[PDB]
Every structure is written in structure tokens, then in C-alpha cells.
């Protein structure tokens, strides 16, 4: 199951 | 025995040919069990593995749309890198990240991994701790003091520790008969005469799962670790693995001369010399 | 920008035997940065249909891919990899060798 969260650089 | 679950991500930059190209692509350990490509007709995560179709359509629409979020983050970091490396809109430029977690044999976490690299070099990790980054130059740590200030360790702790370990779980029993088999090596020495006074003895392992496995010569019961040509472990396309070893050996001293063979399928290690 | 070179290896999914159907494979890998062309060949010539992997990378950011195809082999066919990328100057040709 991937990761949902979006992190941004 | 002790496994592991990855997510890779390539995001390929192509000025002047459209969007970045996003690939991704999950395992565990060496089998691929789903995929994505945002140059497919219709993106989707699709399954690359019958015991991942199971999941339902609610499951693969869920990791669907995180694979579009994260080729949209991508493309947005492929201009804010650019910014931070001070490079021109000209140029290919690529961004990989990693990220996933290894169980032990009692399916207990062992560690977890997230990690990105920009143009083939490290970028930023983090640390084995879960709770802390390694940035490799001054364009990352601009990242680092971000990730700090919104306290995204403590959020891919949580997804690590968490939900990678229990869907790996899920997955190992669910792929039961393919995920948790070893495949042992099949194995054989071949001989190729080079010139009068030299051939070579070539050590064959075929057909084993996983990847990993130590192929050695030994002469006279020494490692000959500096005069052994070592292949690549390489892909069949089955599922199963090659790889060879292979020694130059003097003329008449054949039977000198020992392939070792250890891998997780076996019932325990093999001796091997040229037969005939 | 550091590049690197593929590596490339040719050969068959099972033990080659004359007139059984077999895949043929070329390995790419260790290569940076991830455009390549590879092309199999059939006595010199570019085999049509050819199929690869998705892009994958190993734990030191190098890509690898897996081109292949079904054949049967014959004493007489001569099979080999045909690969280009930026760290070339000219495509690099492997032949398949039954014992590599």
C-alpha cells in the first residue's frame, strides 16, 4: 500500500 | 525469512517533448506486483501480480490516484531543483525517489527507508532513526529545514512503522505459494579451453529465487576472490534469476578447483567441480 | 553531470536447445542517465515487437531494463544486443554466446 502523504521539496 | 516492500519513482524531465515521463513501479522483495506509467493510454496502477488483483477496484483506484499526486509533486519539484541548482529550462533532468520497509522472519519492522536522489546523486534521505534527514549539499538542506518546519519525519515514521508493515504482511500471506517459495539454484560447470595451458571453468546457477546468492571459486580451498570474473545476478524473465563465476585455471589443475553455492532455496550449500 | 555506462548482458531465459522456443534476453545496467535504445538482432537485423521492462533502479540510483523477445534458436541464427546511450559514441553490439 503506497503513502497518500505529498511532500513537496 | 526476512522481506522486504519498495516503491520506486522515476520523473524524467523532456523540455520541449511535453510533461516529465513519471514511472513507478512496487515490490516485494524481487517481485514486481504493481506499475504505472504516465505515458500509458489510460494511467493506471495496474497489477503485475494475481494475488494484488484480490484488493478490490477501491484499492487500485486509491493507488491510482496517489500515482497521479505524486507525478504532479514530481513535476513541480523538477522546477524547484532547477531554481536551487541554478540550471537553465533546457535541460533533461531526473528525479528518483525510494521508499518502503523490511520485515524480519516474525514480520517485525527492521527498518524503514525514504530517499530521493536528483540527477543520479543522493538529494535527501531519511535517517534510519525515522526521525532525522541526511541532506547531501546546501540546494537540499533548503528541503531538509521545509521537512523539519512541517514535521514530515514524524508523518513517514508513522506510514513506515504502520501501514507499510501491515500491508507487507497482508501481501506476504495473501502471495503465500510465490512470495515466501525459494527457488533453489540449478546448477553446473562448464569447460572452455582458452590455449594449451589455460581454459576456463565456469559456474552456472539458473532458475533461483530470490536474487540473492553467493557463487565462489575456490582453489585448494581458498577464496579466489581477485581472479574470479563475477557476472551481474541477472533477470530471466520468469520470476527466477542467473548468475555465473568463472576462473582461468592452468592446464591439468581442473580438480583443484571448487564452486560454492549458497541460497535460501537449497537444502543446504553445494560443492561443485567440473565433472568430466 | 556524472553519467555511466551500461552494462549489457545477452542470453537465454532456459538453456538453449536447437529448435526449441526460448527467450532471448538483454539486460541493461548500471546506466545513468535512463534513456537507452536497445535493439535485438537476427543475423544483423533488428528483430520487430521486441518487449522491456518497466524502468526500475538498484540501491545506487542506477537504472536497469530488461529487453526480450521469444525464439527458437538454430545452429545457424546469430543473435545480439544492439545498445545506445549518451556514454556511447557508437551503438555497442554483444553477440549471444550460449555459455555467458
Given amino acids: 500500500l503506497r503513502n497518500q502523504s505529498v511532500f513537496n521539496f | 525469512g526476512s522481506h522486504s516492500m519498495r516503491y520506486f519513482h522515476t520523473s524524467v524531465s523532456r523540455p520541449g517533448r511535453g510533461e516529465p515521463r513519471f514511472i513507478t513501479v512496487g515490490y516485494v522483495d524481487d517481485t514486481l506486483f504493481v506499475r504505472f506509467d504516465s505515458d500509458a493510454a489510460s494511467p493506471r496502477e495496474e497489477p503485475r501480480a494475481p494475488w494484488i488483483e484480490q484488493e478490490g477496484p477501491e484499492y487500485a483506484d486509491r493507488e491510482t490516484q496517489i500515482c497521479k499526486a505524486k507525478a504532479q509533486t514530481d513535476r513541480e519539484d523538477l522546477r524547484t531543483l532547477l531554481r536551487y541548482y541554478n540550471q537553465s529550462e533546457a535541460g533533461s533532468h531526473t528525479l528518483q525517489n525510494m521508499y518502503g520497509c523490511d520485515v524480519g522472519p516474525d514480520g517485525r519492522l527492521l527498518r524503514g527507508y525514504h530517499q530521493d536522489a536528483y540527477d543520479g546523486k543522493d538529494y535527501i534521505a531519511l535517517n534510519e532513526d525515522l526521525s532525522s534527514w541526511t541532506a547531501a549539499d546546501t540546494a537540499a538542506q533548503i528541503t531538509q529545514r521545509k521537512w523539519e518546519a512541517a514535521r514530515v519525519a514524524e508523518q513517514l515514521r508513522a506510514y513506515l512503522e504502520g501501514e507499510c508493515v501491515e500491508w507487507l504482511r497482508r501481501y506476504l500471506e495473501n502471495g503465500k505459494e510465490t512470495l515466501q517459495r525459494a527457488d533453489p539454484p540449478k546448477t553446473h560447470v562448464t569447460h572452455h579451453p582458452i590455449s594449451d595451458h589455460e581454459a576456463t571453468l565456469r559456474c552456472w546457477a ?71 | 553531470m556524472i553519467q555511466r555506462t551500461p552494462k549489457i548482458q545477452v542470453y537465454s531465459r532456459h538453456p538453449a536447445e536447437n529448435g526449441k522456443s526460448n527467450f532471448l534476453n538483454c539486460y541493461v545496467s548500471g546506466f545513468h542517465p535512463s534513456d537507452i535504445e536497445v535493439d535485438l538482432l537476427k543475423n544483423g537485423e533488428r528483430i520487430e515487437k521486441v518487449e522491456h521492462s518497466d524502468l526500475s533502479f538498484s540501491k545506487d540510483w542506477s537504472f536497469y531494463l530488461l529487453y526480450y523477445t521469444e525464439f527458437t534458436p538454430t545452429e545457424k541464427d546469430e543473435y545480439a544486443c544492439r545498445v545506445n546511450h549518451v556514454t556511447l559514441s557508437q551503438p555497442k553490439i554483444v553477440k549471444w554466446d550460449r555459455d555467458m
Fill in chain 2, 206 to 276: 539458473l532458475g533461483f529465487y530470490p536474487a540473492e546468492i553467493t557463487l565462489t571459486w575456490q582453489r585448494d580451498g581458498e577464496d579466489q576472490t581477485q581472479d574470479t570474473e563475477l557476472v551481474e545476478t541477472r533477470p530471466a524473465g520468469d520470476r527466477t534469476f542467473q548468475k555465473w563465476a568463472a576462473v582461468v585455471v592452468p592446464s591439468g589443475e581442473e580438480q583443484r578447483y571448487t564452486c560454492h553455492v549458497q541460497h535460501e532455496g537449497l537444502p543446504k550449500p553445494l560443492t561443485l567441480r567440473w565433472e568430466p
